[PDB]
Structures are given as structure tokens and as C-alpha cells.
Amino acid sequence: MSEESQAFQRQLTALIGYDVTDVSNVHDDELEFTRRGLVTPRMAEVASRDPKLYAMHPWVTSKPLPEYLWKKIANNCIFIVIHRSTTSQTIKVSPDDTPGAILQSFFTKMAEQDFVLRVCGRDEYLVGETPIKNFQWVRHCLKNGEEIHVVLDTPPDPALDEVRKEECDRKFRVKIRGIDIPVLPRNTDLTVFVEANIQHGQQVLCQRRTSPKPFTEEVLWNVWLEFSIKIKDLPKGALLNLQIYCLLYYVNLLLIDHRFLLRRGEYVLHMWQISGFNADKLTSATNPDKENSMSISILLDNHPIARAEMPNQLRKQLEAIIATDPLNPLTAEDKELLWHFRYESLKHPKAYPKLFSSVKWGQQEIVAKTYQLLARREVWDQSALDVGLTMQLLDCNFSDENVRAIAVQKLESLEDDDVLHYLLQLVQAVKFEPYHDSALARFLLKRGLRNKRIGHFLFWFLRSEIAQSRHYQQRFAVILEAYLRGCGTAMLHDFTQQVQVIEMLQKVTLDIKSLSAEKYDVSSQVISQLKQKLENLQNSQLPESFRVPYDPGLKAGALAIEKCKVMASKKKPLWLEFKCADPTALSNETIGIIFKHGDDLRQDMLILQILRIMESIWETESLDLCLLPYGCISTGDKIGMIEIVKDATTIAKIQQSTVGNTGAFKDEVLNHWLKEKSPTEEKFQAAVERFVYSCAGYCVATFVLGIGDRHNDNIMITETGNLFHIDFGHERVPFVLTPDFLFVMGTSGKKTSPHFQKFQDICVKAYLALRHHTNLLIILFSMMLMTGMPQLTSKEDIEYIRDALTVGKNEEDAKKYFLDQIEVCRDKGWTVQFNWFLHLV
């Protein structure tokens, strides 16, 4: 190993936030093997990407322009304003024109072919054989009434992304020797026993238990648990799952290892505890806290895996089963039917989840048939990719390598635009794989290595988990380290900049929190210190300029200490504001950023990403709802950063305006506020139209997700009329449609108007459009719960969204169902809003 090979690794370590060379917390070599595993996939992707297209990372889409953005072009001409230090001619361009082509009507329009269109003030480029209509920046401008400003500069040097050079028919059994903990005490001395489970996709194949013994600091069984399953019948991916009840602790051991060997010998496993179902319960990882943790002691002494058409009436049984939602439970009868008509089931892609849930993975012979089933995958391969279908196959119910592989195979066809919409959930999905090295992991790896925008967000999603998940940090760590070793020194440098900045600011964030009371107001002394610490940082600490983690196009510069401050909550976040490092920016506006420790922002990351998905759906059907899913990113334990949405105010503060009489409200302030922050009437109406759409979209999306019952506090509006929700960390009312909201639309307690009809129509249109993807939202929503909450109910909590999306009904009953929910809100009015407060005291 080189002397500067080890300075590389230690560089990596500090980016990663966890040291993958460490081997204190392993009982085998799976991770190191996975580090060696991923060297090929990486060096193939790095070896195959186009240096030029890679360096500029054009953000791009095949989807058609939606209806509602073509109406912003009633002339088949788009305006691009090219710049050059001072001057700038506005060039007239057809939606189908290529970057190279509109340089051909720029240079030819004057009277050297190696310049490039770069977005003014961002690290964004308009390049490669793509029609300008198909660039996200362009579409972004069209959606906002913004104009397309572009600067004529040089392509950046690919050299900046140089990657460096790297370097039996016996029944299974298991002796349970005993357990041992240093300190247990609670109050009374209860009994205790161990429960071993052979598991495969949350599915217990077999289960034994010890006699109970009294819970002393060391309990010793010296007992064989003979299982019914046989060695050969054990399927790759099967977890020996040891648990301790008196349910206190758990730990898992793969029974077949990353080399197909049968796990044999002595193991002393350090167990996880339960904070008194979710994805943590599955992890192959042991508890690294060897000093406080409970530990179980086992021994394994036990290589392997070495015509007729249907009578049209059962077909209708099948087809009804196939027609049911992912959280519909399959009865035994269902499964015997599905399985017996394998080859008929195979002709329906949507059937696969339900079909492979009907495999008996506890028998070599049936699995061997399941493998033969998959061998003829001609209907699947040719099928159109369905994301929700494909996801279902990657959740916690499917531990089979090949079942899982076929889903990954379908993802291959996603373009980056789409990978980006699902990346976070695809990352969380890695928690569901049995082995560290998996098709899914090599895919994520490969797609972020292929495109810097995905790479960037891969990083932060991986690092979010590493920083706070004992259960999955080691695995992610290995995946991340795989990536860093091929993202190229350009970005290695950019990530280092970002890690430093956020490390500095979290120090300041947490340091400030101590200084103020747990809850009351703003100490002048705290505003005094904050201003010093940031003046301290600004000089000989803070990197000249960093990329904004949630918006890597934007390079932040120096702070605006004058504008930075501590917020007026109970956790004490930092309103921070930054100059923009790019001097070609068209504007003077600041990069706003909030920094917060106290809420688990991972939840907020996830909910925001759904919102983003919902918008991509409404994009398919020519709908625009003006959701404002702001940037939000986790960085560590109960901590991270949030995008500041310029010009937004709290609806609550709009009622605190005068008095806010501990919980009084007044209807017309919201419309009155809008008039004030509108110069014309023209811009005021444009607000009411936006408030109508935003109000609609947040009403629908929030209702679907169960998070619709919120306070005015956690809801904001921009000056330009765009309502939005904040703060998704964990009588009743479905969504906020308070009498103030209805007033802006032009109504007050049981009446109708030209704009209220518009709201109703949109919600309905919008609501319906989500239901077209019912399956997708359900699988997301359920994955969400499992990988991103405390503990939860694998049926009940999920069940809500099923009821919500009004599963199994017809468009009219839905139209009706939601139109009832509206009517609930106009009946309650303030009664719930006013309630928060009543409980404070």
C-alpha cells in the first residue's frame, strides 16, 4: 500500500463519516469482499462514461412538454438571452432546436465552434443532441414566467474529473449456549427466553424456543434447538433470527454466506435493543457497542445449492386476485391457485409480486421451479416498466436474488430524470437486500457514477444513513466508498467543501442551542454570540464557496452575517443567508438556508420526495399544482439543512398580524395580505389563481399521505400567492381548507363562486390522477413507513392510504368521497385550528 494510498483512504473516511477499513464489528469478511466486489462495476462505468457529457451533466428528459407549458408558447418560438460579460442579444428559437443548432443561428446571425451554453449563475449547461424543449432548466423557466438567460463560456476540463489509480438431509439445528449482559435492571425480575426463527422475506419458515430461565445478568441454556427444515431446503438469503423476550433484543445471522457457504462454528453476537415491522429488524449487522449491549452465544455445527389451458372460471379467480392491491393479503387458497397456474400467472406482469409471494422458499424443489419460471421471462422483459410494480419486488417480502434481480433489470431502462425521482427510495430499498453486494447496489452505484447530479444526491442519501443508522451504516459506507472512488477529483473536492461547511455550521447550531433556554424567545446575548461565531467562521475556516447540497447547481459564497440569525422556536434553528459565488448571476438575491437539530429530517426528506413524485404524475396528465417541495437534507443525528423559500410567510403570522388573540382568527386577512404584496391587480389575480392551484395540490397530496391535519404555523404562502406546507416530522380534519382560504377563492361558509368551482374541479382532477397510480403510492407509502419511522404496523398504518385512495371504487364515488372531505372542512372551519392552543394549556 502506498504512503499516499492511505491518505486517500483517510480522505474518503472523512467524507464518508465512517471507516470501512475497521473490522471490530464483523464476524466474517462480507464487507471487505463487497469492497472488492464493487471494483469492477465501478471501473466499468468510469471506463464507459463520456468525459465531456459527464463533465457538464446536462439535465434532460424524453417526456413530452405537458399541455400547460405549450400554452406558454403561442408562436412556436422560445426566447433565449445569450450573454458575454456585458452585452446580450435575445435570440428567437423554435422548441425543437438543438444547442449546437442555435449556436448555428447565433454565429451565422452575426458575420470558435467549441463554446457552450451555460445557465447564468449556475453550474448548469445546455448541451448534447437534445431539443431545448427537453432541458429541465428551460421547462423550469417556462413554468415560472422567467426568461432563459445563458452565458457563452468554455466547456470545463474533463481532466478535472480524473479518477486516480486504485488497488445434506440432516435437519438444521443451532446450539444456544446462553446470553450475557452487564447491566439489565428495571424494577422487578421477570423471566427470559430465546426465540430462533429461520426467516426469508419477513416469512418465518420455522421457529423454536428455549425453556425460560430467570433473567439474571448471565443466562445459560447449553441447548440444541433442532428445526424441522433440512439443510438442502435452506434458501440463500435466509436469516437465522435470534430474539429475546421476557421482546427486548434481536440479532440476525445469514445462514448462507456471500460465498454460498453454510455458516458454521462459534458466534457471539451483540444484539440490538427495542425502543419501547420495520427495516432495522432485518439487518445482518451486529451492535457495535460491545460494552452495554446484550450478547447471545451460539454454535452452528451443520456447500449446498450445487400445454394445459385453464377452465375460464378459475381464470376469473386468478384475474381477480391479480387485480388486487399490494396490501391485499393472499389467502392460502389464493397462493395454491397462483402457484398451480404459474405459467398463466407469468403472462401478467402485475401478477409477479403476488405470485412470488406464493413460492414456498422453504423447499429446494419448488424454488428450482421458480428459477425455471424466471428462465422464460419474455412477457416481463418486453413489458413497459412499471415503477410501483418493480418496487414491490424490492421490498421486504422478497429475499430471492433472482426475483429481486428482475426488478433491477427493469430499472435499467429509467432515464436519469426518473432515477432522480425515485433515488431516495431506491437507496432506502438497499436495507431490504439480504447481502451487502446486490444488483440494486451496483445499480445505484452505476447510475450516480454515470451522472453527477445523481452522484451528488446519492452521496447525501448514503451519508444521511451512515451518519445515523447503526444498523446499516457499514453497508452504505461500503457502497458510498465505492462511489467516491470513481466520482472523479472534481467532485471529491466539491464534497469535501460541503462536508466542511456543514460540519462547521452544525457545531454552531448545537452550540447555540445549549446557550438559550429550552423554550423562551430570543436572548440578545444569543444573537450576540451567533454573530461572533459566524464572523469567526467567515475568516479562517469557511471554504471560499460551497455547492448547495440540496441544489448542486447553486454555488454559495460568503455569508451575509447581517441577515443570519437564530429562529424563535423551542429547538433553535439558524436562519442563514449566503451570497452567490457565481458573479454571472442575473440577480442579487441570497441563498437562504435553515439549519436545525431536533426534528428527524429524514422523514421530511422522504415526504418531500413523494410530493416531487406526485408532481411528476400530474405532469403525465397535463396537470400543474404549484407544489413547493423545498430542498431539505439530512446530515446526521436529528439534524440537517432546509431550503429557504424566498418571500414566504407563515399563515399563522398572517393571523398574528394583530393580536393573534391566543387563538382568535379573522377570515379576510389572507386576501388582504395578498393585495398588499401585489403592486397591480394583475399580479393579485395571478396570486389567487396560484393560491387556488397550490391550495388544491396541497389539499390532495396531503390528504393522500395522512399528514393533512396541520396547524397554520406549519403552513406558508409566498408573496406571489403560492401556498405550501412545512415540517413533516410526525376530533380531526382531512386537510386545511380554513375559512380564510375559502375567502380568497371568494366564499364563506356554505356558498359557491367561479373560483371555488375551479378548486373543486382541480382537486378532483388531481385526486383522480393520483388514483391512476394507486399501486405506486401504496408501495412508496409502505416502504416509507418501514425504512423511515420508529416501529410500525405492517398492515394497520399502511392501511390508511388504501382507504384514502378509495381503493376498489369507481371514479364517481371517488369524485364524491373527496368532495365530501372538502365539505367536512367548511363545516368545522376554525374548530380544529383554534384547538391547537387549547391543549398547550
Ligand SMILES: CS(=O)(=O)N1CCN(Cc2cc3nc(-c4ccc(N)nc4)nc(N4CCOCC4)c3s2)CC1
Ligand atoms: C423571527 S424569525 O426567527 O426570523 N423566524 C421567521 C420565520 N418564522 C416562521 C418559519 C418557520 C419555519 N419553519 C420551517 C421548518 C421546515 C422544516 C422543519 N422540519 N422545521 C421547520 N421552515 C420555514 N421555511 C422553510 C421554507 O422557506 C421559508 C422558511 C419556516 S419560516 C419563524 C420565526
